[PDB]
């Protein structure tokens, strides 16, 4: 595509510049260009891909929720609120389909190490989750199953291959727990997964260095914040 003429190293360098400039649409276009070079991503490069698209879809999701709330109020006027909510929805769907397409071409297929495979399957679950947030009816059921499946494959590798404090494993469990609570209408599964994840990580903190301890405890605090909200 449009980044085909740029060197892979220049795309990564410009993604970092775009992050510093808070230009996340540019950051995502540069990282898409880097993925489309066909080579595997390093840990740092996977992080850049995730930061870029999380910030782009996060603005879309925030805007969709504001518009959905106004639309719900207006149905308790004209077609304009629905049309504009639909416009933002379609743009958000397009960003999710773009990320899913990168994961399917061919990041997950080539990812053999647990840290890369769990990261990408988690991201697959997250973007199907964002599709599920705006989906209705039977469409919704198949999208929810696609999220659940990706998260479950990621969970099964993470429990076999990573210690319970590994930040990737922790963030997966955090997000799968949010899936269960908000998407799958399974609050008890959400609370059980957050509590078991927190308790198993607590028992493994003794093994960590100061820096690894700070990384793991930061994510554990998010689990605790959700358990406080839910119980």
């Amino acid at each position: 595509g449009a980044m085909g003429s740029m060197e892979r190293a220049s795309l990564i360098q410009k993604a970092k510049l775009a992050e510093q400039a808070e230009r996340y649409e540019d950051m995502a276009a540069f990282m898409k260009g880097a993925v489309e070079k066909g080579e595997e991503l390093s840990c740092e490069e996977r992080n850049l891909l995730s930061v870029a698209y999380k910030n782009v879809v996060g603005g879309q999701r925030a805007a969709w929720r504001v518009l959905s709330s106004i639309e719900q109020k207006s149905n308790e006027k004209g077609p304009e609120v629905r049309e504009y909510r639909e416009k933002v929805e379609t743009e958000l769907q397009g960003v999710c389909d773009t990320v899913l397409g990168l994961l399917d071409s061919h990041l997950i297929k080539e990812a053999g190490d647990a840290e890369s495979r769990v990261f990408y399957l988690k991201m697959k679950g997250d973007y199907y989750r964002y599709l599920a947030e705006v989906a209705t009816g039977d469409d919704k059921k198949r999208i929810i199953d696609s999220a659940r499946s990706a998260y479950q494959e990621a969970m099964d590798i993470s429990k076999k291959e990573m210690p319970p404090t590994n930040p990737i494993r922790l963030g997966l469990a955090l997000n799968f727990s949010v899936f269960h609570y908000e998407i799958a209408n399974s609050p008890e599964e959400a609370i059980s997964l957050a509590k078991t994840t927190f308790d198993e990580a607590m028992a493994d903190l003794h093994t960590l260095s100061e820096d690894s301890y700070k990384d793991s405890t930061l994510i554990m605090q998010l689990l605790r914040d959700n358990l406080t909200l839910w119980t």
């Binding site: 963030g171 955090l174 997000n175 949010v178 998010l222």
Partner: peptide
């Protein structure tokens, strides 16, 4: 209120 997913 919405729960925290990974930041």
């Amino acid at each position: 209120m919405r729960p925290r997913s990974l930041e």
